[PDB]
């Protein structure tokens, strides 16, 4: 029945809510508060829970839904792409890649890879890199020291040639 | 100021209360007040009584009958201006005493049920809906009744039509078949009429030729006589054509329907249709259609005359009236009261439909109360009307008159036939019957022309919904003050004389008299006159009535005049015009703009904020002075006090001016000196030049308030917050913020500045491995939350005046679901006049300030007075709006005699009277010069020399007396401030009333470089503080094609829009100083190709040789 | 690399449709209500139509673009640009053939 | 002002300009002679009729009393000359005096309108659009394609040369010139990309898709859209 | 000719019939998806029934519905439209409507693109201008030429690089 | 010729 | 030609980006290169209102 | 107007060829700095800003100046398609 498939015990509950909303309307006169409809629901129930549920319960909205003028505009027309980077964005991160290279080029080749394997390829490396010590090499608390000197080696250069400063927005 | 009044037509009766249409339609539809419960049908009561009682009972084992006893309401849960602040609807809850009875008669009677609560009207006549001020616009539609049109698809005969007005009511058409029978339409469901001519009870063999006596070709009525015997088997053989051919065992199914009940009538208990149906057809009625409790069969007084009139029209000259569908005696206006009521009907329709369901799913003795009544169908049926109806709209309150005019509008659109059908040149068209009922000039220019329309000043809508107009009764050439409100049809019976008709006391003084005889202009002697117009005022709308010298303006341009006045923005130094018509005072009164004193008294207290008044009884009443508040349109409304402490004050005296009033007279603009002459091209094509002096006098300065909102929303990613602590490279960018996210009340805010600080968890919370490093070089934090702060958009802000904070439901606030809180910042700006601003006079001369000259450059009179504006004359001859020229002449006299004028429409000042005033004025303007020791300027002589050759001045007459001659034509000698020399030949100058016109956001200045793009289509899209692009249409595509500008067209439709990498490479190129790359294939096409593919159609781009070419390079090609 | 000079529209054979398809949609599921990740073998499956994030498999084993063009061993998702999702076709194999309505209701019914 | 009493009017203004560009049998169809000849007029109280008479040929035009004669007994009329007042049916006139004449008529008849409105525009503009109303012909005696086929004229440099000459093909294609309105003439293009872009989208594609139609982008619209 | 019959229905790439999350934890999505769903559902069921060796009458019934389901997807409303059960009796947009627009068409119109280096404003006469000139508000010129501007900024001692120049203009 | 358009249910019955 | 007048008409502005589009714009679209009408071949940029008025007087 | 529009027109057989030639000469006049120019020092386009007439940056212009001196040659099928994009990089560096 639903566009966004849902578990069965969740259709149960949704149907159980829209049941209790009926009593609580006529019981009270007004449409019940969330706290009202939670007490009625039972033991596992909560203000937040009623709300967070009904959110999930909805249709949802058709992109092809017309807007006010009806003939020419549709809901979808107004939704902006926030995935793909816009000429300004794209142009930046491409330059960044180029200027970071220019930066860590003048470094020890072993050192440069350390940071490239602490971040520069893919994974945070809380400790993982410090285990497989740059494939081969002295591990853990002696790699901790390399990060320091490598990062601090860039500060020598960067404070002087302000290239990377401006990318901090 | 002294005020000279003009013309002499005594108006025997003042203008009706102007918002009457609105205030009274509603008053008499709710009846909340004076009518106490068991009192009167008409409105919502009738809406109840027609749905209740509701039965479903078989006496023996069950029986469920639900009654209606009472209606009540009266606790708007929140104050008026509190509904505005918190985006609520100002409305009362509605209760009804119902009472359920049983087959064993459960005597237990129910009580209240506020399952349903409904919007209340403001004092002025509007509504508050979800915080917004709205106006319901009343609509014209074809009145119920019986009409006889000519056949369109036949050049010979006519069609009869019986019209009722339910949403469940049938349009019956009676015709004569191409081959002479009797076509009969119910739905589209055609059938041979005859048949029903038996079911009446009386058959073919009693009256079919006796009452159709003339009926010489009555070969449509004729047919089956053996069928026309028994009334029982009469009905049966007809239900065949109400399918799907169900047995006649419950025979009287649809005939019980179209008998008397809540369907077949056109109006309850006669009225409307019948009232006409009588004068159109026979005499009597059967109550409303055909009444029969217990007798034999069914009463016919309906079709009998109806047939015998189609007959009497297919006859020579008995009756013989083809119906004019556009006659205002055939069209009525559905007002708010009705409009809301018949929308309260569709509500109760679904209510009882939900009630009938809960007999099946329901026991018997288990549910007596309202355990079956539910609001939701009715609640949302009514909230649907007020919020989303075509007929409910954003109250236009650019200024007081905007609102007044808005409330008095009349639409042909909505649930009546609209724009698609457009019935061009019909409907859109001023009918002979509009005289005094609808303004023939006030209408929207453009494609709504003649569809929306304005109700004329003195006009009034009666209980049946017909517009009436006052005429005074004239008996034997003497004219009584006994006034009558005729409808369009009553009027057609009379010989009505015009109002300017010369009176000698009450006596008609003239030999011959101009009159209308059912629309027909005729000259008659006074013996033949039966009624007289009240005043020219009655023919026109309010807005039009505000145009002085209207009779000298062509209509097309007076339309523009009475429209532009609506768009006049309230100035801070607003003036009422030098030449007024009359209305300007009384408009402010009715518009509820200004604040008046309700009783005789003395002023106790007065500050910018409130006035307190001791009334002669001892009463101390305080009047809060609504201050610097925001109209729908962003224009300001604020009452200022015009009264001092200990001032004695009569009842109805002024206390505070509205936004657009000067001492209770409508002040929509400035009065300003205008010289009409060309000026070096700066006034070239309706464009206007402006003395910087205006700017200095704060002369066209208006105050505008913009509202900004920001939502703090819960996310799937987690909450975001209003906060002072945003992450970035600035501190001077937080200066006037401090206040815990929000900008300090009183700050000057420029475009791009921070109104409200906000941080969201962003990007599914991944920082770039590339930015990961960038950060750790600078003492990394790499924070999760993003700067989503609200900024003043480009194109300016101004200065902050109020910030308003609403939170997490808890105060009395219903927020959008998912929202934690909102913040509002209101930003005020004193818009001074500037190049681009658009000015207008009331005679539809409209232009744009193209130049602001320094006072030294401005054309000046000999006494050293410069002029304020320079209007080009070329804007007059083709426009034929000579009214402004007259306005100027009188205005010139006024300027020197220190007086203002009231010059009534088609009455008022006349050339010789102006010339007399100009003569007096000349004494001031010139008379003194000799006394102060000055003769005539050498330049004054130079000019007259040329002036007498133009034959403006008499030869031989002295320099001075020539100058007077010239001043009487309203022309002066003007010096050019650039050269000092005079302008060869005299120039008309004088005071003109001019309005600065409201500036809409759509019409504000726009510029895009590059911005957001549409998710689905990947086309430039408008952001929050980033403009969308311009639209490039096929029309523009042709212009480019016709130029052969091939590359421009290409780059317009790829790089500058659709082509994705195109637009990036383009940017990157430009930044790096390289020329733009050649564009690729635009998305528009790629997508197109995919759509067709999704339709199992192979679209295939081929090279020179017929090998396929990939347009998605690699991204589409598989494996 | 060479410029297009003709556009040709022809009927699509089932072979041609299967040709375009990057996989069969077998399940009428869309997105997962709780996690918002496209449900497997459904109308949004990354496995069929492509990655949602530029150069990143579903499970998350691969990123960087270093691995450009590799289908993942665990999650089955190609590591390319995400944009590829607006251009990649799927298909549905019908249990019984069905008539294309254009070639039936447009008169004269080209098949009739 | 003062001219609508009960006689069917000649179209005026824009509706007339359309009447031509799509033409389209006119309102008060003027009766035209189909052959050169001399005029004889017979009538009754009721019946009225014009005869055009040559040596062999002799055509009669029975016509209503409504009609306003334009021609004297004993006058000489050329094929395609109107005999009554009113607008000539172009289709009718095309059948009488062929292409050139109808084209001439269309251009002037259109001009008649614009100029009466003070509008000045070169004939060549109209002549261009008109050429396109004559774009197509209908075949009467085949070559290798079928019998009706309303179908473009300048596909004939080889195909009105293949009889004995270049490639040969038994039957030399005999065709009938054909007048059609701008609406219709526009629907009928080679470029399905354009054709689909005007009214009736589903049809065009279905047609082209079956036929495997290629569109060499010869026009502009098709190049733009791409 | 066979090809006019479908035995594999193609599927439009999801990114352009998306499933966006909008405000309030609610969603927006194309009708196609809902058209596609119900088709998949009926096909899959048809497989089961055939696999079950169900009575040919209940199979016909299924095949009927499948044919219809395909119709409804390709060109909806050439046989009595289907609608989303709740919402309203608004007919679902099929491919055919999505292509051409249901408004007869492809005219009418709904036809035009938005554009990247553009602006609009009220005009005022310029008597001073020579015939080939026009007056542009600098504020508007500055946006229209922004990228070009940014480069000159770099070529002059008024900005180190482009990011810093762009920041100057915000 | 839009006669037997919406049979489905009637048909199956 | 624009059929513009100054009662508040707005114009849209567009910017020819490329070396090529600029050449088109400048050589074939520049106002001062389009003085005669392409419909009638009569001048189109011609004295208009106040301009005539002046010169006539 | 542009300095020499009438005579620029007189130089070609189609209005549109002018535009083409000009654009393309502008494209190369940019691609190789302004080194290609067939315009002797003293006749180079000029501006005014920061107060010091530097060379006019507008290549759309430049090309039009050069055409009018007649130091250029244009034709439909002159030199081969790639014996040009390298041969022009010889005399003036592509950098
Ligand atoms: C079957 C093809 C139908 C079609 C038009 C598809 C293209 C679509 C929907 C788009 O993406 C386009 C669209 O909306 C609008 C345009 C421009 C602005 C105007 C095109 C009209 C041109 N006209 C002429 O140049 O006249 C000689 O181009 C498109 O490609
Ligand atoms: Mg205008
Ligand atoms: Zn993976």
Word description of this protein:
Chain A: It is found in: Cytoplasm. Chain A: Interacts transiently with the RNA polymerase catalytic core formed by RpoA, RpoB, RpoC and RpoZ (2 alpha, 1 beta, 1 beta' and 1 omega subunit) to form the RNA polymerase holoenzyme that can initiate transcription. Chain A: This is RNA polymerase sigma factor SigA. Chain A: Belongs to the sigma-70 factor family. RpoD/SigA subfamily. Chain A: Sigma factors are initiation factors that promote the attachment of RNA polymerase to specific initiation sites and are then released. This sigma factor is the primary sigma factor during exponential growth. The structure is cut from a larger assembly and holds two copies of chain A, one copy of chain B (1119 residues), four copies of chain C and one copy of chain H (95 residues). In chain A, α1 packs across α2 and α2 packs across α3. Chain A folds into two domains: 54 residues, Winged helix-like DNA-binding domain superfamily/Winged helix DNA-binding domain (Arc Repressor Mutant, subunit A, Orthogonal Bundle), CATH 1.10.10; 82 residues, Arc Repressor Mutant, subunit A, CATH 1.10.10.10. Chain A is built from seven helices and one strand. Chain A is mainly α and 169 residues long. With 1119 residues, chain B is α+β, with helices and mostly antiparallel strands. Chain B has six domains: 204 residues, Dna-directed Rna Polymerase Ii 140kd Polypeptide, Chain: B, Domain 6; 333 residues, no CATH class; 180 residues, Alpha-Beta Complex (Dna-directed Rna Polymerase Ii 140kd Polypeptide, Chain: B, domain 3); 65 residues, Rna Polymerase Beta Subunit, Chain: C, domain 4 (Roll), CATH 2.30.150.10; 65 residues, OB fold (Dihydrolipoamide Acetyltransferase, E2P) (Beta Barrel); 132 residues, RNA polymerase II, Rpb2 subunit, wall domain (OB fold (Dihydrolipoamide Acetyltransferase, E2P), Beta Barrel), CATH 2.40.50.150. Helices cover 21% and strands 22% of the residues of chain B. Chain B is built from 25 helices and 60 strands. In chain B, strands 20, 21, 22, 23, 26, 27 and 28 form a seven-stranded mixed beta sheet that branches. In chain B, strands 41-54-42-53-52-57 form a six-stranded mixed β-barrel. A five-stranded antiparallel beta sheet of chain B has the order 11-12-13-14-15. In chain B, α11 crosses α15. Chain B is globular. With 112 residues, chain C is α+β, with helices and mostly antiparallel strands. The longest helix of chain C has 7 residues. Chain C starts with 5 loop residues before the first strand and ends in a 7-residue tail after the last helix. Chain H has one domain: Eukaryotic RPB6 RNA polymerase subunit. Chain H is flat and about 45 Å long. Chain H is mainly alpha-helical. Helix content of chain H is 40%, strand content 3%. The chains are: A mainly alpha (169), B alpha+beta (1119), C alpha+beta (112), H mainly alpha (95). At the C-D interface, β1 of C face α6 and β8 of D. The complex binds the ligand CCC/C(C)=C/C=C(\C)C(=O)C1C(=O)C=C([C@H](C)CCC/C=N/C(=O)OC)OC1=O, magnesium ion and zinc ion. Zinc ion binds next to loops of chain C.
């Amino acid at each position: 029945a639903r566009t966004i498939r849902i578990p069965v015990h969740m259709v149960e509950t949704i149907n159980k809510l829209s049941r209790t909303a009926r009593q609580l309307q006529q019981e009270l006169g007004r449409e019940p508060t969330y706290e009202e409809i939670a007490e009625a629901m039972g033991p596992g129930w909560d203000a937040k829970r009623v709300e967070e549920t009904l959110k999930i319960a909805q249709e949802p909205v058709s992109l092809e839904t017309p807007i006010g003028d009806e003939k020419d505009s549709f809901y979808g027309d107004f939704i902006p792409d926030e995935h793909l980077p816009s000429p300004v964005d794209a142009a930046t991160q491409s330059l960044l890649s180029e200027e970071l290279e220019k930066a860590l080029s003048k470094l020890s080749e072993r050192e440069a890879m350390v940071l490239k394997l602490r971040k520069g390829l893919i994974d945070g490396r809380e400790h993982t890199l410090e285990e497989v010590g740059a494939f081969f090499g002295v591990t853990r608390e002696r790699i901790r020291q390399i990060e320091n000197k490598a990062l601090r080696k860039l500060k020598y250069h960067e404070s002087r040639t302000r290239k990377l400063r401006d990318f901090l927005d | 100021m002294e005020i000279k009044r003009f013309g002499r037509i005594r108006e025997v009766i003042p203008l009706p209360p102007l918002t009457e249409i609105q205030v009274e339609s509603y008053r008499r539809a709710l009846q909340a007040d004076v009518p106490p419960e068991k009192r009167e049908n008409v409105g919502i009561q009738a809406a109840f009584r027609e749905t209740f009682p509701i039965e479903e009972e078989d006496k023996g084992k069950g029986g469920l009958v639900l009654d209606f006893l009472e209606y009540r309401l009266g606790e708007p849960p929140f104050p008026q201006d509190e509904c505005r602040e918190k985006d609520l609807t100002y409305q009362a809850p509605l209760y009804a005493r119902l009472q359920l009875i049983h087959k064993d008669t459960g005597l237990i009677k129910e009580d209240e049920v506020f399952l349903g609560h409904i919007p209340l009207m403001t004092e002025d006549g509007s509504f508050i809906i979800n915080g917004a001020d709205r106006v319901i616009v009343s609509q014209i539609h074809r009145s119920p009744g019986v009409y006889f049109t000519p056949d369109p698809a036949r050049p010979g005969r006519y069609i009869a039509s019986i019209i009722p007005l339910p949403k469940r009511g049938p349009w019956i058409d009676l015709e004569v078949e191409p081959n002479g029978v009797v076509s009969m339409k119910v739905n589209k469901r055609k059938f041979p009429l005859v048949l029903l001519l038996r079911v009446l009870g009386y058959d073919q063999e009693t009256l079919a030729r006796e009452l159709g006596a003339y009926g010489e070709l009555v070969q449509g009525l004729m047919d089956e006589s053996v069928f026309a015997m028994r009334p029982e088997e009469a009905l049966i053989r007809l239900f065949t054509l109400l399918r799907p051919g169900d047995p006649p065992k419950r025979d009287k199914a649809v005939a019980y329907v179209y008998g008397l009940i809540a369907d077949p009538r056109r109006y309850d208990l006669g009225e409307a249709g019948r009232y006409k149906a009588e004068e159109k057809l026979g005499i009597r009625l059967s109550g409303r259609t055909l009444a029969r409790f217990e007798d034999g069969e069914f009463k016919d007084e309906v079709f009998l005359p109806t047939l015998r009139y189609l007959f009497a029209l297919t006859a020579g000259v008995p009756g013989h009236e083809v119906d004019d569908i556009d006659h205002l005696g055939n069209r009525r206006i559905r007002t708010v009261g009705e409009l809301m009521t018949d929308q309260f009907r569709v509500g109760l329709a679904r209510l009882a439909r939900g009630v009938r369901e809960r007999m099946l799913m329901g026991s018997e003795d288990s549910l007596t109360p309202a355990k079956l009544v539910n609001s939701r169908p009715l609640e949302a049926a009514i909230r649907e009307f007020f919020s989303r109806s075509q007929l409910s709209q954003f109250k236009d309150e650019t200024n007081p008159l905007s609102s007044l005019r808005h409330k008095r509008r009349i639409s042909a659109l909505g649930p009546g036939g609209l724009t698609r059908e457009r019935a061009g040149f019909d409907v859109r068209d001023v009918h002979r019957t509009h005289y005094g009922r609808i303004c023939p000039v006030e209408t929207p220019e453009g494609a709504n022309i003649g569809l929306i329309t304005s109700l004329a000043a003195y006009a009034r809508v009666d209980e049946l919904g017909f517009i009436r107009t006052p005429y005074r009764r004239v008996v034997g050439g003497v004219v009584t003050d006994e006034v009558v409100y005729m409808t369009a049809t009553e009027e057609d019976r009379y010989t009505i004389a015009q109002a300017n008709t010369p009176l000698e006391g009450n006596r008609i003084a003239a030999e011959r008299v101009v009159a209308r005889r059912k629309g027909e202009p005729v000259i008659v002697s006074p013996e033949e006159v039966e009624f007289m117009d009240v005043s020219p005022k009655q023919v026109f709308s309010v807005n039009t009535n505000l145009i002085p010298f209207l009779e000298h303006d062509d209509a097309n341009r007076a339309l523009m005049g009475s429209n532009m006045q609506t768009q006049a923005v309230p100035l801070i130094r607003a003036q009422a015009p030098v030449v007024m018509t009359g209305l300007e005072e009384r408009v402010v009164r009715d518009s509820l703009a200004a604040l008046y004193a309700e009783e005789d008294g003395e002023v106790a207290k007065v500050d910018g904020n409130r006035i307190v008044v001791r009334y002669e009884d001892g009463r101390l009443v305080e009047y809060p002075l609504r201050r610097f508040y925001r109209s729908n349109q962003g224009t300001a409304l604020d009452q200022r006090p015009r009264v001092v402490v200990g001032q004695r004050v009569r009842k109805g005296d002024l206390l505070a001016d509205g936004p657009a009033s000067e001492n209770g007279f409508l002040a929509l603009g400035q009065n300003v000196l205008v010289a009409i002459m060309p000026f070096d091209g700066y006034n070239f094509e309706d464009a206007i030049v402006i003395s910087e002096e205006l700017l200095k006098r704060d002369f066209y300065t208006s105050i505008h308030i913009e509202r900004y909102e920001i939502e703090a929303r819960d996310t799937k990613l987690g909450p975001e917050r209003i906060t002072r602590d945003i992450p970035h490279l600035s501190e001077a960018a937080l200066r006037d913020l401090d206040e815990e996210g929000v900008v300090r009340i009183g700050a000057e805010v420029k475009p791009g500045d921070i109104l409200v600080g906000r941080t969201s968890f962003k990007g599914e919370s991944e920082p770039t491995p590339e930015e990961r490093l960038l950060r750790s070089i600078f003492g990394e934090k790499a924070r999760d939350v993003k700067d989503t702060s609200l900024r003043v958009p480009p194109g300016e802000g101004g200065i902050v005046v109020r910030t308003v904070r609403l939170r997490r439901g808890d105060p009395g606030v219903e927020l959008k679901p998912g929202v934690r809180e909102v913040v509002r910042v209101y930003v005020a700006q004193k818009r001074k006049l500037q190049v681009g601003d658009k000015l207008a006079n009331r005679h539809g001369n409209k232009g744009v300030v193209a130049k602001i000259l320094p006072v030294e450059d401005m054309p000046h009179l000999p006494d050293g007075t410069p002029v304020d504006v320079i209007l080009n004359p070329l804007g007059v001859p083709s426009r034929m709006n000579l009214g402004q020229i007259l306005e100027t002449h009188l205005g010139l006299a006024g300027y020197f005699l220190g007086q203002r004028y009231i010059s009534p429409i088609f009455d008022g000042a006349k050339e010789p009277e102006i010339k007399e005033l100009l003569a007096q004025a000349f004494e001031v303007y010139f008379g003194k010069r000799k006394g102060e020791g000055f003769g005539v300027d050498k330049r004054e002589v130079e000019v007259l020399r040329r002036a007498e050759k133009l034959g403006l001045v008499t030869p031989g007459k002295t320099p001075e007396e020539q100058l007077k001659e010239l001043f009487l034509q309203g022309k002066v000698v003007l010096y050019d401030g650039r050269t000092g020399e005079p302008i060869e030949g005299p120039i008309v100058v004088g005071q003109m009333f001019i309005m600065k016109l409201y500036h809409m956001v759509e019409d504000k200045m726009h510029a895009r470089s590059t911005g957001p793009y549409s998710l689905i289509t990947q086309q430039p899209l408008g952001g929050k503080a980033q403009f969308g692009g311009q639209r490039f249409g096929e029309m523009e595509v042709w212009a480019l094609e016709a130029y052969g500008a091939a590359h421009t067209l290409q780059e317009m439709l790829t790089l500058k829009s659709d082509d994705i990498e195109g637009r990036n490479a383009a940017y990157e190129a430009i930044i790096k100083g390289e020329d733009v790359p050649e564009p690729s294939v635009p998305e528009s096409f790629r997508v197109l190709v995919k759509e067709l593919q999704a339709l199992a159609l192979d679209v295939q781009t081929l090279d020179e040789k017929d090998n396929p070419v990939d347009i998605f390079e690699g991204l589409a090609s598989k494996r | 690399k060479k410029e297009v000079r003709k556009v040709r529209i022809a009927l699509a054979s089932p072979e041609k449709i299967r040709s375009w398809s990057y996989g069969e949609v077998e399940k009428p599921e869309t997105i997962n209500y709780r996690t918002l990740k496209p449900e497997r073998d459904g109308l949004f499956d990354e496995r069929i139509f492509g990655p949602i994030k530029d150069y990143e498999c579903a499970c998350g084993k691969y990123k960087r673009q270093r691995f450009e063009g590799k289908v993942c061993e665990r999650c089955g998702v190609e590591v390319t640009k995400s944009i590829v999702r607006r251009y990649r076709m799927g298909h549905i194999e019908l249990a019984t053939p069905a008539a294309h309505i254009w070639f039936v209701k447009d008169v004269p019914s080209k098949i009739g | 002002t003062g001219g609508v009493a009960g006689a069917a009017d000649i179209t005026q203004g824009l509706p007339r300009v359309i009447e031509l560009f799509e033409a389209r049998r006119p309102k008060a169809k003027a009766v035209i002679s189909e052959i050169d000849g001399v005029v004889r007029i017979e009538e009754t109280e009721e019946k009225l009729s014009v005869f055009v008479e040559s040596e062999g040929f002799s055509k009669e035009y029975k016509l209503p009393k409504e009609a306003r004669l334009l021609v004297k007994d004993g006058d000489y009329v050329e094929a395609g000359q109107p005999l009554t007042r009113g607008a000539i049916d172009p289709h009718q006139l095309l059948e009488a005096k062929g292409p050139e004449a109808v084209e001439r008529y269309l251009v002037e008849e259109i001009q008649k309108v614009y100029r009466a409105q003070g509008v000045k525009l070169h004939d060549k503009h109209i002549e261009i659009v008109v050429r396109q109303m004559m774009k197509y012909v209908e075949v009467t005696d085949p070559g290798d394609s079928r019998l009706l086929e309303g179908q473009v004229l300048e596909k004939w440099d080889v195909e009105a040369l293949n009889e004995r000459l270049i490639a040969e093909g038994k039957t030399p294609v005999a065709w009938k010139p054909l007048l059609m309105g701008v609406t219709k003439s526009a629907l009928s293009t080679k470029s399905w990309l354009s054709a689909a872009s005007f009214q009736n989208t589903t049809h065009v594609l279905t047609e082209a898709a079956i036929a495997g139609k290629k569109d060499e982008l010869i026009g502009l619209k098709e190049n733009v859209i791409l | 000719p066979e090809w006019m019959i479908l035995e594999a229905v193609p599927v439009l790439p999801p990114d352009l019939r998306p499933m966006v999350q909008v405000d309030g934890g609610r969603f927006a999505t194309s009708d196609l998806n809902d058209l596609y769903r119900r088709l998949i559902n009926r096909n899959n069921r048809l497989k089961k029934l055939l696999a079950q060796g169900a009575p040919e009458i209940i199979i016909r019934n299924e095949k009927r519905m499948l044919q219809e389901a395909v119709d409804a997807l390709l060109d909806n409303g050439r046989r009595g439209a289907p609608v989303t059960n709740p919402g309203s009796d608004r007919p679902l947009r099929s491919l055919t409507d999505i292509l051409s627009g249901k408004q007869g068409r492809f005219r009418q119109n709904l036809l035009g693109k938005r554009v990247d280096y553009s602006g609009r404003s009220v005009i005022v006469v310029g008597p001073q201008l020579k015939l080939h000139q026009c007056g542009l508000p600098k504020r508007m010129a500055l946006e229209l030429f922004k990228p070009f501007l940014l480069k000159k900024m770099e070529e002059k001692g008024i900005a180190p690089n482009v990011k810093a120049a762009r920041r100057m203009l915000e | 010729p839009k006669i037997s358009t919406s049979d489905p249910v009637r048909q199956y019955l | 030609a624009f059929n513009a007048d100054f009662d508040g008409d707005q114009m849209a502005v567009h910017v020819p980006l490329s070396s090529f589009a600029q050449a088109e714009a400048r050589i074939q679209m520049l106002s001062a290169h389009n003085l005669l009408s392409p419909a009638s071949g009569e001048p189109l940029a011609k004295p208009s209102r106040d301009i005539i008025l002046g010169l006539y007087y | 107007a542009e300095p020499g529009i009438d005579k620029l027109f007189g130089m070609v057989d189609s209005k549109y060829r002018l535009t083409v030639v000009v654009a393309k000469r502008a494209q190369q006049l940019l691609r190789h700095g302004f080194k290609n120019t067939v315009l002797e020092p003293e006749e180079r386009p000029k501006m005014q800003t920061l107060e010091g007439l530097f060379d006019d940056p507008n290549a759309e212009t430049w090309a039009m100046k050069e055409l009018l001196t007649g130091r250029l040659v244009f034709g439909e099928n002159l030199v081969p398609e790639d014996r040009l994009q390298k041969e022009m990089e010889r005399i003036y560096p592509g950098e």
